[PDB]
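Obj.: predict assembly geometry.
Materials: sequence records (below).
Method: joint structure prediction, all chains together.
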Amino acid sequence: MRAIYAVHKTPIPEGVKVFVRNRRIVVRGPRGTLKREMRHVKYDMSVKGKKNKEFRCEVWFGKNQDEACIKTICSHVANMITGVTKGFRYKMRFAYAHFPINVSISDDGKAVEIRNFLGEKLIRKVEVREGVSASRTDPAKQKDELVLEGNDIEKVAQCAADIHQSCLVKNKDIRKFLDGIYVSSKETVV
Amino acid sequence: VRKGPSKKVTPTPGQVLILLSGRFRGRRVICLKELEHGIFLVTGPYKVNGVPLRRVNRRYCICTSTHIDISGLDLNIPEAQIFARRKALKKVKKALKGKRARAIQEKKDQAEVARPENSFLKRGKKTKESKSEEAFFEELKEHKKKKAGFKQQYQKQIDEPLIKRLKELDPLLTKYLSSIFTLQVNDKPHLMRF
Amino acid sequence: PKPIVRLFQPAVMTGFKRSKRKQDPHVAILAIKNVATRKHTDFYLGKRCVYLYRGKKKVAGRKGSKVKTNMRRIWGRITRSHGKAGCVKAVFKPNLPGESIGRKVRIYLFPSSI
Amino acid sequence: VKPKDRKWRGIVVDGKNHLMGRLAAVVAKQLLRGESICVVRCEDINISQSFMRNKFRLKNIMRKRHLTQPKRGPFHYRSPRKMFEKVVRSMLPYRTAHGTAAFERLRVAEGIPQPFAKKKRCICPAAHRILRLAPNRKFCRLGDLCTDIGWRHDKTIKDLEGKRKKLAELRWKKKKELTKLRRAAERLVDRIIPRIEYGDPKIKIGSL
Amino acid sequence: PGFSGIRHYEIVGRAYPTEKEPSPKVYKMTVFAKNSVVGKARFWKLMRKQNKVKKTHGQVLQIRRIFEKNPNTIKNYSILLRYQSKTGVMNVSKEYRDTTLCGAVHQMYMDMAGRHHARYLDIDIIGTTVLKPSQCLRPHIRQFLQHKVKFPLLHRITKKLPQHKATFLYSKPSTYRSGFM
Amino acid sequence: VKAKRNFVEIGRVIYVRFGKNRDTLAVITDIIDHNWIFADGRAFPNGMKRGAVNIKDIALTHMKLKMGHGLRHRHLKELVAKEDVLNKWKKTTVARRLEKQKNKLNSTDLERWRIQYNRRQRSSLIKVKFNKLKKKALQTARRLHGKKNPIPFADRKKPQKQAPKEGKVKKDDKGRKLKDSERRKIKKCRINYKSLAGWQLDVNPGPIAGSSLVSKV
RNA sequence: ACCAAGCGUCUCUGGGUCAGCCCAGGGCUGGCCACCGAGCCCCUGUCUCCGGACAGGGAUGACUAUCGUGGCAGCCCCUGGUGGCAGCUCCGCCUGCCAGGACCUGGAGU
RNA sequence: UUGAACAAUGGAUCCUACGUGGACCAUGACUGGUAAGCAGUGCUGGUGAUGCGGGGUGCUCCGAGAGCAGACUUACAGAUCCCGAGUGCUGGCUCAUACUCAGAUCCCACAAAGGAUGUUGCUUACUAGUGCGCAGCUCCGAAAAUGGAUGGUGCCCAAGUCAGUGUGUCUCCCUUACAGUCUGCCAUCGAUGU
RNA sequence: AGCAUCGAGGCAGAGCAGUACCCUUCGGGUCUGCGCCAACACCAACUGGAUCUGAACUGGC
RNA sequence: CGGAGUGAUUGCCGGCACCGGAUGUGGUGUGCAGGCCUGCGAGAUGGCAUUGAGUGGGCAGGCUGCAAGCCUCCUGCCGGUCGGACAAACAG
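Observations (raw structure tokens):
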């Protein structure tokens, strides 16, 4: 079965403009600008409003995988809208039983550093993507807390996952030894 | 819209043909009349095309859809005297086995072929010889010369009122016949009408 | 110079009549230019065709030209079609050589019937 | 351009966005029919399946070696041009005189070198990836596969192709201006001698 | 569609009247078969195996190929069939939009071959019917049962005769044009 | 997409390309499914006879009618007449490409020669005039975007020169200037001398906008 | 005498055009009589610029005038040959000097 | 109605010289055996004794049977190229990250139980959703030793797979066997007139 | 064969023009217009099924 | 031969200037003007457009370099072939 038509729409807020051409979606906004070349697919991806604008992704004679990938493209564009309007901010909380994980953002913005993870003398260097700021929160607000804020949910969440996978536990029962840096919340910078 | 039946594309008097082979490849000529079945007398005028009074097989010419309206022109020609036989001693190589069909379809050919005349000593062709390679060569030269001069009479007798007719008809026909027909890379003979 | 004029169609000798593992060297297959359907071969059916190749010694040229040439000619006729994609079956005399395959062959518009 | 290539004449086929084996087969049949072909930009040729699938296919192909002496064994080329030449070889009867004649009419090249950049290149509709593969389907790139198995000259050809494209853009703009003023000349003559076109009932022997 | 290679016959037959049964019952089958040979074949394959009347003891009174009354209006034919698989028999109800009943039957046969690897002699057509657009239960039919269906031609490949199938096409194609050439 | 498209809808005018009624017009009177449509085209010259056509066989024309499914001939012919679809089609670009092709096909030998003689006449002028315009535009490009001699004029050692054979006519050429019609044509084409100077080696002009058309099908 | 081109006879053989018989398909009189209500159609408003959405209502959706179904008419067509919507079964018939017409175009032997 | 059909250059009566008397293959017709390219049988046909076209290759499969040539046409089976014949036409289905690349005409060159919320269809119970199921393809199950084999290449809206279609009609339904038809010649066995 | 034809990218895309703009990373997107069948006269046409072009006749006057 | 149209093309004498490394854009390269750009535009042809003489301004320049004459049209004279002549390789 091939549906003659399927469309998924994403309402665009005011103050944000979503340009799209050749399936290269560019999104402007107060927090900045994003681009995404969703050219690995062959769908319509237009913006079709004057008063209240919407990004509509359409597929003509597609299959259920197309009716699903339309929604995932629309969701990516909605996350770009969020990243340019309110921004993304992932808060990672440190967890350690005996050895204080000492985290240090390097000279530039990049390169989070993890030392004394589980007593190990290794040092975990995680050089963050450009487009995402990592800042260590002061212990008054919340001790043992890093926050990664940006305009690209992909970049921010992948930096969070990179810090996570840098602080992993090997050769031990991971039901015990629960140490690591864990994403405590996926918030917005608003 | 009518497909109609199939017909034998054949040259008519006053039809522009295109010679497919020979000394004059692709030249456009005017079919005058049919001499034998399938052999026609043509001339793309010796002033227009440069093609003299000539014969052509219906098989080495393209029959275009250009008709000249050759009406009212003197097309009488001593075909036997102009075009020699070139095969002397017409039908003697072996003693005739008899022509032993008695009334129809041998006699009706033998009598019809005993009717026509023979190109006599001047208007006939000359078979070759040596005579010190020159006593034949010179005499052949003047024989050919006088035969060409005798043919020029009839050729101009046709071509002077034939050009005055095609110019009278419309003036571009003389350049139409002066131009030679060629095939180029984008011409597909199996699709070209004529 | 005199106007050199082209009154033939080019074709390629695409091998001999053959099954998968044996062949008939008497009937050559020819693919004609811009002819790509069987309907378009009814023109060339019956036409004469010549295969031109170059020797070393000088052989006599055209009939009556009395000048020799390095070209040599094998004349034939297009006898039938072959398949659906515009190939024809032609017969030559003498049979086309073996290094004739993948080579050009001229197909003249005579004997003409239109 | 070197002398032997200065002597070259034939068809130039843009191998970009072409399915490798379908390209090879069209090129092979035409070489057998006697054409000279140069398949240019063999790094941009496409293959019909996933990158990883074709990578493993090439791995298992290069697994094949003569165990007594490999230097005599099946040669596994790292150049996209040479991989393509071997696919075309396989499609041709290269172990006969006419087969090697066809294979030597084949003229594969990488990037777009000069005797072929000076020429109008074409594409085979059959064997073209866009006109052949369903958009649903996956595909890879021969230059990607060849750099995967080696072939240190991808970027070297990318730079040279960028330079060629800049020169081509200059020439394209000059050609645009010249075709502008050539239409100008045509109209100027259309004033003098009106163009007689095929769609005309006036062309006849009572006219003309 | 085009040339449904199937003809519809309404065959009527009985048994030769014996002296015990001087008026045997009369049966009328509806057969969608390539030709009348296969049609009468199927008729007798049902006569035997449902009535114990054999082609050699039976007698065809009518055959009557049926032509479509108005082939210029689209109908929605629901075909109820049964077919044999590697395992046993399965009942199927399918439906097709077509201008002719023989067209819908050829559509059904090629569809069954595609989806289930069924064959002509392994498919047995139980009743066929024509449905009002309010009675078609399948999605790929209900999507065309609207009045003004409308869609573009997007990844088109521009079918063209072999006479001018460019082997080298020195131009640049475009899958999204109207495709006149 | 931002391009405007043609849809397959009841009321379309389609170009039937294959079949006994090839190269004709038709109206989509119904859509069978996503592969087949039902088209009637007997309101057209030698058009189709109300059959079922394949979407691979059809081609979509730029226009469309306001009609319901399966419109009878009585109303469809008056709609195509009132909306003037035949002329609106013959005025298109594809119509003229197809008509030039079909006229080349059905052209006789006299017609082919007349076109060939016309182009052989017009080429004697087009070649010269294109060479003239190209020469003058490239000279303008040199005068604008080139490198002029820092040496002024009448202060450079002007070169050696031959003698006019002592017995030749003078025969001044008046064509040494661009005529005002030529100048207006160039000023209309508004050449980009930036581009004309950016590339040194001469190139061939490509084809022209309507090279493959026949005006007024 | 030989080689080649052409035109014919006869015996076969391949590929075509128009026909003829019998039917079919349509068109026009928006033919006439009776049914159909939807795959809908039309008029409003609002949201909107969406190759539109929804809520209303309307069979004056009348007078010719969207589409279909059952039957009964006259007149016109090249527009076709069961790849069609079919005659007194099935099957269109006829295969092309021996169920009968006019031709076209190749090939083999003679 | 000379009393069933069809066929039939045939019936009767003899004499006589040899070779053979290892067989083998195929099929629910089977028997012994776990089985075997095992052993032993039955009917028929083949191989032996037999070439030719196809199955890449193969004594046995499929077609067909063989004097020397010419023309036409086909069988089995085929058409991405190798390789003659459509990168035919019309609807589907399938995408397979491996070292068995998904798959790819009989024999035959393997695959099973079991499993999958991959996907396409259909039946069916419940009041659009949730259950059972059933078929098509796909995936796992799926391990051997020189490097290697749908025959190679490769193929992915296929060049895989399932159907339909190519009609004395077809825009493209064509290819060709030593087979069918016609012709010439050679030889054989005859008939007729001599 | 006339040994005539050299943009790039794309293919679910307006084309073209602009001495306009952003980096959204230097080829992508935005913006402004419809003159570019250069008067009018088309489709937002465009798959080379195209374009261009006649190898042109014997010497001298 | 000659006349008109067109001033384009080729070759050469100078000098000037400019390029080209994927296999120099080199097939041992390219261009070179009594001019060009922008305004006015006498007149003449069509109902304002076309064509078009000069002229203002600006920018350049072999301050007309030489030789030929290609091409389209018009028109010939003498002499020659016209014996490959009904096809025999694009008449070579």
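Conclusions so far: Residues 15 and 98 of chain C are 8 Å apart (CA to CA).
To do: check interface contacts against the pulldown list.
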